[PDB]
Each structure stands twice: as C-alpha cells, then as structure tokens.
Amino acid sequence: HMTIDQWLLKNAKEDAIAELKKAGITSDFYFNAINKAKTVEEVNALKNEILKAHA
Amino acid sequence: EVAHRFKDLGEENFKALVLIAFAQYLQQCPFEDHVKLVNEVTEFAKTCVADESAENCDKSLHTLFGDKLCTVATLEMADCCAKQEPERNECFLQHKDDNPNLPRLVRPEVDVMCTAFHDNEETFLKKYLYEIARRHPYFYAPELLFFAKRYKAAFTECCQAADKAACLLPKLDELRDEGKASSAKQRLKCASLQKFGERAFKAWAVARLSQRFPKAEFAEVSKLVTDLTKVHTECCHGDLLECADDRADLAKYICENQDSISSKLKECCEKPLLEKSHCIAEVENDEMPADLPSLAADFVESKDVCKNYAEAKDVFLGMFLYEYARRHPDYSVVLLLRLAKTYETTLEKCCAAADPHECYAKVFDEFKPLVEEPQNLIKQNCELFEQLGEYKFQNALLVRYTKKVPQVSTPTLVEVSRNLGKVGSKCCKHPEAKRMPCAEDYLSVVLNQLCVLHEKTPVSDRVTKCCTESLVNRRPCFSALEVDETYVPKEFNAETFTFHADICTLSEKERQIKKQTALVELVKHKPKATKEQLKAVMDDFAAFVEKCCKADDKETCFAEEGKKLVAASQAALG
Numbered sequence: 001h002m003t004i005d006q007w008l009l010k011n012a013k014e015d016a017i018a019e020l021k022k023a024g025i026t027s028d029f030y031f032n033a034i035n036k037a038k039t040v041e042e043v044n045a046l047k048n049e050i051l052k053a054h055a
Numbered sequence: 056e057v058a059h060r061f062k063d064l065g066e067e068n069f070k071a072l073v074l075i076a077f078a079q080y081l082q083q084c085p086f087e088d089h090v091k092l093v094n095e096v097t098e099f100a101k102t103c104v105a106d107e108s109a110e111n112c113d114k115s116l117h118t119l120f121g122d123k124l125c126t127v128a129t130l131e132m133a134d135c136c137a138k139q140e141p142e143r144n145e146c147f148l149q150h151k152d153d154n155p156n157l158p159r160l161v162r163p164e165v166d167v168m169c170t171a172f173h174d175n176e177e178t179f180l181k182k183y184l185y186e187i188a189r190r191h192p193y194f195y196a197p198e199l200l201f202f203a204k205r206y207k208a209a210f211t212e213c214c215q216a217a218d219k220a221a222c223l224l225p226k227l228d229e230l231r232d233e234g235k236a237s238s239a240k241q242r243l244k245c246a247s248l249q250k251f252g253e254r255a256f257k258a259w260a261v262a263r264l265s266q267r268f269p270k271a272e273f274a275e276v277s278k279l280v281t282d283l284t285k286v287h288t289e290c291c292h293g294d295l296l297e298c299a300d301d302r303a304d305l306a307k308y309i310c311e312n313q314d315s316i317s318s319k320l321k322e323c324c325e326k327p328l329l330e331k332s333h334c335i336a337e338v339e340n341d342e343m344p345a346d347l348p349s350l351a352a353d354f355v356e357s358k359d360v361c362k363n364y365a366e367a368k369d370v371f372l373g374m375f376l377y378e379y380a381r382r383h384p385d386y387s388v389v390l391l392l393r394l395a396k397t398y399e400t401t402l403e404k405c406c407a408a409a410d411p412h413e414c415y416a417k418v419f420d421e422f423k424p425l426v427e428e429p430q431n432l433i434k435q436n437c438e439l440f441e442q443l444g445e446y447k448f449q450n451a452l453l454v455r456y457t458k459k460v461p462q463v464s465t466p467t468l469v470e471v472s473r474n475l476g477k478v479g480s481k482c483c484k485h486p487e488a489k490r491m492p493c494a495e496d497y498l499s500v501v502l503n504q505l506c507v508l509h510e511k512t513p514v515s516d517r518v519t520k521c522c523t524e525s526l527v528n529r530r531p532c533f534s535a536l537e538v539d540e541t542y543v544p545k546e547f548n549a550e551t552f553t554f555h556a557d558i559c560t561l562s563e564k565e566r567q568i569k570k571q572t573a574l575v576e577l578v579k580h581k582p583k584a585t586k587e588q589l590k591a592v593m594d595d596f597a598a599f600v601e602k603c604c605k606a607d608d609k610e611t612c613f614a615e616e617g618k619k620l621v622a623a624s625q626a627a628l629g
C-alpha cells in the first residue's frame with residue numbers, strides 16, 4: 001500500500017507523460033527520464049524543460 | 056519575522072549582517088553613522104523579539120530596512136524613497152556603483168594591525184568589514200561574514216607568534232585573493248548571464264551539478280539547474296533577501312532529498328541555515344554509481360538518435376552533458392561544454408543528411424583532441440612547475456607572457472603571472488584526476504581579472520580578441536597566442552635596473568615582486584633574449600641581491616656593483 005507521497009509521485013509522472021504526449025513528444029527516452037524522477041517538483045521541472053525545448 | 060531572523064541569527068550574526076547591508080546600499084557614509092544605525096536596528100530586536108505585538112514588528116524586512124534607510128541629512132538617487140516599498144526597492148539597487156570612487160584601501164603594517172586587534176577586536180573587525188563591504192556592493196553578505204570569521208581566526212593566531220608577519224600576511228593575502236575572486240566570479244556569472252542568457256548558464260550548471268552529484272538522475276539535476284538559475288537570476292539583481300530566501304530554499308530542498316542526491320551532504324544538511332547553502336556549494340563530488348555504461352548506446356549507436364534530438368534539442372543535449380559530466384569529474388566544466396558544443400554541431404550537421412548514422416558514427420573521436428588539449432597543457436605546466444618552485448615558475452610565466460604580449464603593462468604582467476603561478480601551487484598538488492577542474496576555477500578569474508584590466512585600457516589586438524570570445528574559448532584563445540616577433544625593444548632606462556638597500560627590508564613577497572618587475576622590464580628591453588641568456592642574468596642577479604644585503608656597506612654595494620651587473624648584462628645581450 002502506497003504512501004501518499006508515493007501516490008502523488010506516480011500520478012505526477014503519468015500526468016506529465018500525457019501532457020508531453022499531447023505536445024508531441026513521442027520518445028520513451030523522455031518518458032523514461034520523467035519516470036526516473038523522485039519528486040513531484042522534479043517531475044514538473046523536467047516536464048517544463050522538455051516543453052521549452054520542443055520549441 | 057524580524058524576531059525570526061534574530062533568534063535564528065544570534066545577535067553577532069544579525070548585527071554583522073545588518074552592518075554589511077547598510078554598507079552596500081549607503082556606500083558613502085562613514086563607519087560611525089552605520090554603527091549606531093545597526094544599533095538603531097538591533098536593540099529594537101531582542102525586545103521587538105520579547106514583545107511580538109509591538110509596532111512595525113511584522114512589516115517586511117524590506118519595509119523595516121528601507122524606512123530605516125531614509126534617516127539622514129545627505130541626498131539623482133533622490134527620486135527614491137518616494138515609492139511605497141517593492142514598487143520602490145528596484146530604486147536603491149538600480150543606482151549602486153559598479154565600482155565606487157573612494158580611497159584604494161592600503162594595508163597597514165603588521166605591528167599596527169595586531170596592535171589595534173588586541174587593544175579592541177569588535178571595532179577593528181567591524182571597521183574592516185564595513186570597508187570591504189562598501190567597495191564590493193554586490194558581494195553576498197553572508198559570504199562576507201564567513202570571511203570575517205576566517206579573519207578573526209587568522210588575527211587571533213598570528214598576533215601571538217614569533218613570526219607575526221610570516222604568518223598573517225600570507226593569510227591576509229590568501230583571504231584577499233579568495234574574496235576578490237569570489238566577488239569576480241559573482242560578477243562573471245551575472246554578466247555572462249546577461250550576454251548569453253539562461254541557456255549557456257544552464258548548460259554550465261548542468262555540467263557542474265552532474266560532476267558533483269553523479270548519482271542524481273537527470274530529473275534531479277535538471278531540477279537543481281532550474282532552481283539554481285532562478286537563485287542566480289535573483290541574486291544578480293542585488294538584493295540580499297530575495298537572494299537569501301531562494302538560496303535557503305534550494306538548500307532546504309537539496310537536504311530533504313540528500314539520500315537521493317549525494318552521500319556527501321550529511322554535514323552540510325545539519326548546519327545552521329546561515330551556513331547551509333554555503334556548505335552545499337562547496338561539498339566534494341560524490342562517487343559515481345559503479346556500472347555506468349558507455350554513452351554510445353543512447354547517443355551514437357541508437358537508431359532513435361535524431362528523432363530524439365529533434366523532439367527536444369536542448370534537453371537531449373542536457374542529458375548528454377549530464378551523462379558525460381557525471382562520468383568525468385576529471386574534466387573542467389568548459390571542457391565538457393566544448394564536448395557538448397561539438398556533439399551539438401555534429402547532430403545539426405547531419406540529422407539532415409542522407410544517412411544520419413553515417414555522419415555521427417564517429418563523433419566521440421572528435422572529443423579526444425579536445426580532451427587532450429587542456430590535459431597536455433596541464434601536464435607540461437605542472438611538470439614545469441614541478442621542476443621549478445612557485446617562485447621560479449612565476450618567472451617562467453613572466454617571461455612567456457611578456458614575450459607573448461609585451462604591450463601589456465608591467466604591473467599587469469606581474470599580477471597575472473604571479474597569480475597564474477599561484478594557481479600552479481593550488482592545483483598541481485592534486486592528481487591528474489582533480490587538476491583540470493581546479494585549474495579552470497582559478498584560471499577563469501585570473502583570466503578575467505586580466506581581461507577587465509585590459510578592457511578599461513586597451514593595448515593589444517590579440518588580447519581583446521581573446522576577452523570577447525565565448526567563456527568556452529577564452530582560455531584556448533589565450534593559449535593560442537604566439538610570441539610577438541614584431542615587437543621592438545623598449546629603451547634602456549637606468550633607474551629601472553638600479554636598486555637600493557631598501558629591498559633588503561621589504562616583505563619577501565614585496566621583494567620578489569620587485570625582482571619580477573625588473574624581469575618583465577628586462578624582457579621588454581631585450582625581447583630576443585634566450586631564457587638561456589635570461590638564466591645567466593637572473594642568476595647573476597640573485598647573486599647580486601645576495602652579495603649586497605649581506606654586506607656591511609649596502610648603498611655602495613648595490614650602486615657600483617649595480618654597474619658591474621648591468622654592463623655585464625648589457626654585454627652578453629643585444
């Protein structure tokens with residue numbers, strides 16, 4: 001049974017990966033990287049970073 | 056809120072801090088105005104602390120500061136204080152002086168310094184704190200405080216020794232140098248951040264944090280990069296509070312996540328808030344995980360290389376920098392940067408070619424030359440340094456750079472060469488693992504110091520051509536300079552090769568400087584001399600300052616044997 005912390009982190013990752021998919025990122029390479037994040041903040045900083053670079 | 060800071064800081068620290076603060080905004084007020092001003096801010100605390108319900112106690116430190124910071128006769132920074140706090144403080148800050156117009160502060164004699172320090176510590180230390188504070192208005196206040204605590208230690212120590220001088224001077228010198236360079240490095244980042252925006256800055260931090268936290272995942276490092284870019288961006292505005300709050304938060308965040316980030320952060324994370332971001336910024340690199348694969352899979356051999364890079368270029372590049380950097384704490388950041396630049400160019404040059412893979416298959420080969428360049432450069436110089444001492448090494452450099460750019464002013468050649476040499480002793484101690492990164496650190500500032508000195512006094516085509524290059528190519532450019540074969544000898548001037556007993560009494564450091572000054576002048580008057588020839592002279596010259604200075608009759612020794620030495624050197628050269 002997940003901690004609230006573990007639940008939030010898992011969510012943020014799915015969230016962020018969908019949100020990247022909807023912007024046009026297709027590569028496991030980025031989703032993997034999102035997946036190795038340990039913190040929700042890490043999840044969103046890197047999502048943000050991937051979006052800025054997609055332009 | 057101000058009670059928060061006082062119990063947290065502990066009178067001494069709070070007071071030291073506030074003094075510094077005023078000194079950096081009010082650069083021109085005398086020490087005694089600030090002392091009581093600190094007092095009229097303290098001793099409101101420790102009571103405003105006891106009574107939390109008191110008046111103005113809850114207002115922002117900016118408010119409490121800026122309202123204090125509007126009490127006193129003298130004044131176009133006047134337009135300020137009309138505004139009603141933030142929506143105001145962009146005011147004071149916008150007028151601060153790059154470098155202010157006040158007495159180039161000369162150091163007292165040892166005897167004196169130690170005297171004033173034993174007769175009273177508080178005043179002599181705070182005095183000097185205010186003083187340094189005002190000439191360095193962008194100098195993060197806590198870092199300055201840490202130096203002040205290092206100053207007390209050095210004074211406490213050397214003022215009770217046989218050698219008061221041989222002890223303290225070297226420490227003041229080493230402190231001064233760290234300070235100045237700490238400051239120069241702040242400016243450097245800030246300026247660079249303006250000239251090249253966030254992107255170059257981020258690339259830098261990515262490289263740096265990856266070396267330092269090799270176990271952290273990309274997302275951890277990237278996160279730290281974002282937060283750090285923020286911190287420097289705010290700290291580059293110039294406001295302690297905005298800067299400090301961001302630093303303290305970033306530090307808190309690293310510590311909460313230390314187990315993931317680095318096994319080297321136990322001590323730092325259990326330090327008081329004041330010191331924690333400081334202790335972090337200088338933690339040793341962690342050990343990299345044990346079985347890192349080659350970077351070939353993901354960055355060369357993979358089929359998806361171009362799909363991936365196109366989808367988010369800067370991040371792909373960041374991940375490459377990340378993977379390279381954490382595997383190479385031996386490299387300098389600028390080297391890693393050169394490597395990523397190359398990689399980048401290559402992906403650009405062929406993810407649009409008929410066979411992408413065909414081009415980039417060989418890309419790591421392109422890194423050997425680049426790694427090899429500084430590597431070799433360190434070997435020969437540290438080798439050369441190892442043959443000769445710090446002193447003679449400095450002289451080798453004096454000769455090398457005077458031959459390269461004689462147009463430069465002797466004082467500058469002496470300072471840079473002396474510093475370049477100092478750099479050698481600080482860095483060659485370390486093994487071939489730690490050397491390049493240590494060189495970069497010390498070298499960039501020494502180099503910029505030269506550049507700044509050169510900016511406000513152009514003299515050489517090739518030097519400014521080097522100073523306005525990318526930070527990545529700055530040192531390579533400097534290293535590409537050739538001996539100036541075109542340069543015509545300076546004319547003799549006797550006064551410059553004549554010495555007096557006075558040198559026997561100078562600081563050893565000050566003595567060396569005098570000899571080194573003459574050496575540069577020598578090269579400038581005989582640019583063709585062989586350094587086989589220079590040896591002979593340098594050797595006659597040392598024997599000259601040995602014969603005199605140990606001789607009963609010194610004025611005459613230096614004088615008519617100065618003749619002996621000159622004619623002996625005028626002959627044998629030209």
Ligand SMILES: COc1ccc2cc([C@H](C)C(=O)O)ccc2c1
Nearest residue numbers: 160187199202230231233234235
């Ligand atoms: C952080 O400690 C410092 C920083 C800068 C300094 C500058 C100087 C003087 C003005 C100098 O020689 O230029 C002295 C001591 C200093 C200590």
Ligand SMILES: CCCCCCCCCC(=O)O
Nearest residue numbers: 162180183184203206227231
């Ligand atoms: C915070 C105490 C500072 C002590 C000042 C040291 C004097 C050295 C002056 C100089 O480096 O040219």
Ligand SMILES: CCCCCCCCCC(=O)O
Nearest residue numbers: 060197299302303328329332
């Ligand atoms: C406003 C109180 C003085 C600034 C706060 C003390 C410095 C710690 C912040 C940091 O980690 O860099």
Ligand SMILES: CCCCCCCCCC(=O)O
Nearest residue numbers: 263302305306332335336337
């Ligand atoms: C000192 C080299 C660059 C900083 C690396 C360490 C990160 C410290 C973050 C901070 O507290 O500001």
Ligand SMILES: CCCCCCCCCC(=O)O
Nearest residue numbers: 257258369370372373395396
């Ligand atoms: C100086 C050329 C190196 C390019 C590296 C790109 C830096 C951005 C990394 C990131 O956004 O996380």
Ligand SMILES: CCCCCCCCCC(=O)O
Nearest residue numbers: 387390429432433436494530
């Ligand atoms: C006087 C010693 C010169 C050695 C060169 C130092 C290399 C710095 C790292 C770099 O720019 O890539």
Ligand SMILES: CCCCCCCCCC(=O)O
Nearest residue numbers: 456460463471530533534535
């Ligand atoms: C006028 C002084 C020139 C600065 C020396 C440049 C340092 C780079 C090391 C080297 O290649 O020698």
